[PDB]
Design a binder for these strands. Structure first.
Lengths: 181, 339, 134, 140, 55
RNA sequence: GUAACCGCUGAAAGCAUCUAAGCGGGAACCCCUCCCCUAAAAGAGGCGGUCAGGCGCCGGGGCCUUCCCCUAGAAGAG
RNA sequence: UUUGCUACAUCGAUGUCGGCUCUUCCCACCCUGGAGGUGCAGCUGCCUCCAAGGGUAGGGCUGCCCGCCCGUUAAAGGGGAGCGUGAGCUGGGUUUAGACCGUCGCGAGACAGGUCGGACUCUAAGGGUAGGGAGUGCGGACCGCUUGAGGGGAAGGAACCCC
RNA sequence: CAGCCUGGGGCCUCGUGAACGCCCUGAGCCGGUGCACAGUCCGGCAUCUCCCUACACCGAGAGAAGACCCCGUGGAGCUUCA
RNA sequence: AAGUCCCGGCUAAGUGCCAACGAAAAGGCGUCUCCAGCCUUAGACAGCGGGAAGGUGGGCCCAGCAGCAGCCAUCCUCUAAG
């Protein structure tokens, strides 16, 4: 096929101001505000309506229409964080040695694993808050991508269990995400 | 059938040629490492060597806290007489040439030692004022700041020479403005090795190795004598083949000069900086050198180069371990190197 | 077996097909170095051995029941000049070994002549029946 | 005669240089690091990385030797290897100069662009020249 | 596996229903994906979990 | 900076989807830091100083050989 | 990579097996690195993929290659470069002339069956290569010090032990 | 698993004083083409000139109408039941 | 030596930029166009909760197989549903 003229709209929620210029988008919300660039949307024109988001394009291919909807999802996700908080959950299960984790500024450190004395670390993207209560790690923030990549960075660090041992289900693992608050 | 064999000789240093200045120079510098203005190397001379007795300082030594025996080299450390300050900056074409020099011995230094080798400045235009403030005008846009210093071998009868070498050292430290002032002070005076070094430091060595003359391939690249029968047949001290074809008669062991090279040395930790010549001088006058009569550097291991060569020293480029000071000693060999 | 992580090894001493005496009561008297455990070499370099090395030899002169047989031992005596860590130089008037059982203990029950200190740590079972140590 | 290569396609921008070369008039190029090559990062490096022999670098730019890795090295081989192989081809190559940024004494003179070399003529997936030396070995 | 996901049916949270692997390229794929992510061979077999109790 | 690959945000194709764009890691792999020869690099560099004084001339100033040796070596060189 | 055919090139010669030394390449990876699956409790396994940077021995029998085996090691990978290399070598195999032995022949003798000895030439015109030196230009003579395009690298690699 | 020293060569200097390879002086290297392995051809890479010494890797180096295989209604020799 | 010539469309590998010459079977919904067949506004697919069922878990041998231990049938309580 060939999508002739596909148009979609995004109703901007209240208590939000939106600024757009130079094909660079920034969204401000009570939870927070993040700037997300969209200079890479060749073949897509972006119209910032005073009360909504106007997205139009003419004669997109199979590639572009996936791209357009792909652009759409992030923007509302950009909106969603600015109103409702993103709360990933990381549950830790250990077999023989209890696991301890502490925060170091923009870096995370985990040790007391299955017997190795070394240190393990992961990187946290700026502007992202992550804390621990107990048996669980709370990852806060507005940007959805920022927490997940941060959350994933922990997941990579704790993966080291996987060499020549059948996996012992031991380490740091994702639990759930996105409480309404 | 074509068994495994490491390529013999050392392909790493081609070309192998003889240096063009008896006193080499470093081409990089280890980072300043978060500190204040001071120099990062020193000059000296290869006087001799002996063996010394110490308690091990390496906290992870298998020989920690015990007396073990180790050969040690002595380096007489005559005072250094600075000459000038050199300005390096990102010039046109984005390079790091010399912006300007800053010479001053008309204010102090009525010494013709320098005159023996350079027909240096007269008092007619000792107007470095417009030169010096040029640095001040060009302040904040400067990258590196070396130093012009000369040796004073005339204070060492061991080396029968009187025209000296003037060479360079780059200085790192705190802020740039500080460093220029730090250097400014050092001009026109004398500087001991203690002004740059302290015992228990690491130090790097770049210098000229013991020359040997034209050599044989057996010796140059440690190529192998052909087995038995060639000790009787057609010739013995040569490589058989010289490449699969004229497709690059290649980097293969071929004769040539060996020695007198610009080389390298890593991980050298000093032992003692003493000042009593009687504590170190061996029996009957040190071999081929004389009688050390200035401050000396007590360096273990081996140091490249022939006796009576100037040597230029340097802070560690990739130090293996951070050393503490004063690996205290227990014996010095004053026995004759002869006998 | 227990100390080789320290300065296990010194100046080159011996080679394959090198003949040494059997300094014990096992019944063997003369043996020839047949091989070297552990060591890995390069082109044409004959494999090495000195004091305190798992070494492999065979019986040349001794009791018939042990003649032409294979057994393991350790090197205890060498003629080589070499430098101890404290900077002394040790030598033995000849070259001797003591046959050891495959588990590690010496096969023999008696020791002949002095042994350098080093072997004792690498083979405490040798030190168990060691008489004098130098 | 001065030409800017900012936001220009090196291969495309190369061409009209050559006719100016064959003309017999001295030329210059400024801000050369601001040209681009179409293609993703992997290929464009790989399509250049294959030529490497060894690594280091120890002079001011002036040599022009068998392997280019300075920002204004790459422009030369691309402009040189596109010149007559006869004797004048060498001689015309003598009349070209390369630069990074803007030489001071050429600021107050005109510059021209080659419209055919505009980035707009290309779909996308391009990389700037200066980015290359970062991966190519140019500290600058 | 020690590999989790943002919100899916990952094993470590009190289960072992591992992912799917490719018989051809030797890599892993999604649970319900019908073909490999790399060679698309579609002859993908589930990773064995364990012998829980008996036959 | 990368291979294989492991991830994340994610549509196509509502879900799902590590990939399509988008984003992160990820090797004895390629490069930069190390050392070695480099101003015959043709863009062929920069910086310090001297080459005087006097009436082409006087004059001297520089350099080399010669001289004595060796840190060095076939001479050359240094 | 061998081995079968082809006779396009070489018969006024491109001197033939192996081995020695020495250089380099390639990847269909022997080990070392990375990742994974497993009928992976852990070790040991088995297998896939990426990865050619480095390493990949020492002996006995056999002239070899091949092959059998010894004791260690990470294993003791396989191939190319005119089955790499004789104006660098050994002549052990093999291509002569002397003989013996076995089969065949009345005979001259033949054998692809075995065994003893049997000559291994060259002062590098030119290039490559490795050093060391003079000059011109870069620019009047100089003295001195420096900037630092490219060039090469393995300048390290491996194992064992302590906890 | 190599090392040191000595004599004569080899180094240099005075005197004497040749021969070999020569279509050439124009020959650097790498892919390619072609008699299926170039110095000239094609395409790149470079490549300042002069001199001395060491190396024989190449110059499909030189030495010799190949000692082998076959042809010529070519020789010689030997033998016999031609 | 002359076209950075035009229209339309496709390719992301430097695939390719090759007449005489240089990659098979298979795999790919990776992508780009085209034939069938079947459901779709009497509400399509997908997606989201419930009813998602009962004599009966019928059952045969079978401790029990209470669809899914070895063969297999099979009616209404029923209706916008089993």
């Amino acid at each position: 096929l060939k999508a002739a003229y596909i148009r979609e709209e995004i109703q901007i929620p209240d208590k939000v101001k939106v600024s757009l210029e130079n094909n660079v988008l920034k969204v401000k919300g009570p939870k927070g505000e993040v700037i997300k660039d969209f200079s890479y949307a060749k073949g897509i024109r972006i119209q910032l309506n005073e009360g909504k988001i106007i997205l139009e394009t003419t004669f997109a291919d199979r590639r572009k229409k996936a791209l357009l909807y792909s652009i759409i999802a992030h923007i509302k996700n950009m909106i969603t964080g600015t109103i409702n908080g993103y709360r990933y959950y990381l549950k830790v299960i250990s077999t023989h040695f209890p696991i301890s984790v502490k925060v170091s500024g923009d870096e995370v450190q985990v040790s007391n694993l299955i017997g190795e004395k070394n240190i393990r670390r992961a990187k946290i993207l700026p502007g992202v808050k992550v804390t621990v209560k107990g048996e669980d790690i709370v990852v806060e923030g507005s940007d959805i991508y920022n927490v997940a990549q941060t959350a994933a960075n922990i997941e990579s660090s704790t993966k080291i269990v996987g060499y020549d041992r059948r996996i012992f289900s031991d380490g740091i693992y994702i639990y759930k995400k996105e409480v309404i608050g | 059938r074509k068994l495994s064999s490491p390529r013999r000789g050392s392909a790493g240093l081609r070309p192998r040629k003889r240096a063009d200045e008896i006193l080499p120079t470093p081409k990089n510098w280890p980072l300043v490492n978060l500190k204040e203005p001071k120099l990062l190397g020193f000059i000296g001379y290869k006087a001799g060597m002996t063996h010394v007795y110490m308690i091990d300082d390496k906290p992870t030594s298998p020989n920690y806290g015990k007396e073990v025996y180790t050969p040690v080299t002595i380096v007489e450390s005559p005072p250094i007489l600075g000459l000038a300050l050199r300005a390096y900056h990102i010039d046109s074409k984005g390079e790091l040439s010399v912006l300007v020099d800053y010479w001053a011995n008309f204010e102090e230094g009525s010494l013709k030692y320098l005159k023996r080798k350079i027909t240096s400045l007269k008092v007619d235009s000792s107007k470095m004022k417009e030169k010096l403030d040029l640095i001040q005008k060009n302040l904040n846009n400067i990258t590196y700041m070396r130093l012009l210093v000369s040796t004073q071998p005339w204070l060492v009868p061991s080396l029968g020479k009187k025209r000296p070498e003037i060479v360079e050292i780059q200085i790192g430290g705190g802020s740039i403005q500080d460093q220029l002032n730090y250097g400014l002070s050092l001009l026109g005076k004398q500087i001991p090795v203690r002004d740059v070094f302290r015992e228990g430091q690491l130090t790097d060595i770049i210098g000229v190795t013991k020359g040997k003359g034209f050599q044989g391939v057996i010796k140059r690249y440690s190529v192998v004598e052909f087995p038995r029968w060639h000790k009787h047949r057609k010739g013995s001290r040569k490589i058989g083949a010289r490449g699969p074809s004229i497709s690059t008669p290649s980097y293969v062991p071929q004769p040539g000069q060996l020695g007198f090279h610009r080389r390298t040395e890593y991980n050298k930790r000093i032992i003692k900086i003493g000042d009593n010549v009687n504590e170190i001088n061996p029996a009957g006058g040190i071999v081929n050198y004389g009688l050390v009569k200035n401050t000396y550097l007590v360096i273990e291991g081996s140091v490249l180069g022939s006796r009576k060569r100037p040597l230029f020293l340097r802070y560690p480029i990739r130090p293996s371990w951070s050393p503490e000071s004063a690996p205290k000693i227990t014996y010095v060999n004053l026995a004759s190197q002869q006998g | 077996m227990n100390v080789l992580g320290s300065r296990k090894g010194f100046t080159p001493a011996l080679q394959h097909n090198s003949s040494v005496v059997v300094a014990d009561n096992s019944g063997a008297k003369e043996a020839v170095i047949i091989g070297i455990y552990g060591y890995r070499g390069v082109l044409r370099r004959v494999p090495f051995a000195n004091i305190a090395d798992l070494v492999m030899v065979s019986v040349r002169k001794g009791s018939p029941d042990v003649r032409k047989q294979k057994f393991k031992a350790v090197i205890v005596r060498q003629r080589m000049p070499f430098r101890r860590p404290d900077g002394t130089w040790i030598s033995f008037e000849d070259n001797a070994v003591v046959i050891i059982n495959p588990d590690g203990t010496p096969k023999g029950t008696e020791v002949r002549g002095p042994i350098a200190r080093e072997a004792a740590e690498r083979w405490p079972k040798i030190a168990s029946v060691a008489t004098m140590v130098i | 005669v001065i030409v800017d290569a900012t936001n220009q396609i090196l291969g495309r921008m190369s061409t009209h240089i050559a006719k100016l070369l064959k003309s017999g008039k001295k030329v210059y190029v400024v801000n050369a690091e601001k040209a681009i090559i179409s293609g993703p990062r992997s290929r464009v490096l790989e399509g250049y990385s294959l030529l490497f022999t060894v690594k280091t670098m120890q002079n001011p730019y002036r040599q022009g030797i068998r392997r280019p890795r300075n920002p204004i090295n790459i422009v030369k081989r691309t402009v040189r290897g596109m010149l007559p192989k006869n004797k004048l081809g060498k001689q015309i190559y003598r009349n070209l100069k390369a630069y990074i940024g803007i030489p001071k004494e050429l600021e107050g003179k005109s510059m021209i662009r080659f419209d055919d070399a505009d980035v707009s003529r290309l779909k996308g997936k391009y990389i700037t020249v200066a980015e290359l030396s970062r991966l190519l070995g140019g500290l600058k | 596996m020690p590999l989790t996901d943002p919100v899916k049916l990952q094993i470590v949270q009190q289960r072992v229903f591992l992912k799917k692997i490719c018989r051809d390229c030797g890599a892993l794929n999604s649970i319900r994906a019908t073909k490999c992510r790399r060679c698309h061979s579609s002859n993908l077999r589930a990773k064995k979990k364990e012998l829980p109790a008996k036959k």
